[PDB]
């Protein structure tokens, strides 16, 4: 659940970069940012009630 909450968070920002990347070279870093998934998963195993 949290993993998919995180997937949505990532997919959230990736859509913003679909418009941000100038031309075609945008597969790697232009679409992915590991910040959300980490905070989400991490949050669950150390902070979840």
- How crowded is residue 6: how many other Cβ atoms within 10 Å of its Cβ? 20
What would you measure as the largest C-alpha separation in the chain, in angstroms? 44
x/- mask, DNA, residues 1-40, rule CB under 7 A, reads ----------------------------------------
If binding means CB under 7 A, how many residues of this protein chain bind DNA?
2
Q: First CA to last CA across the chain, in angstroms?
A: 15
Task: Specify the residue, 25 or 46, whose C-beta has the smaller distance to DNA.
Answer: 46
46 contacts DNA (rule: CB under 7 A): yes
Burial of 33 (0-12, 13-18, 19+ CB in 10 A): middle
Q: Could you say whether residue 47 binds DNA (CB under 7 A)?
A: yes
The footprint of DNA (CB under 7 A) covers 46-47
């Amino acid at each position: 659940d949290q993993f998919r909450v995180g997937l949505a968070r990532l997919a959230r920002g990736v859509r913003e970069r679909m418009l941000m990347g100038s031309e075609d070279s945008l597969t790697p870093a232009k679409l992915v940012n590991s910040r959300p998934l980490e905070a989400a998963i991490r949050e669950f195993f150390s902070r979840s009630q």
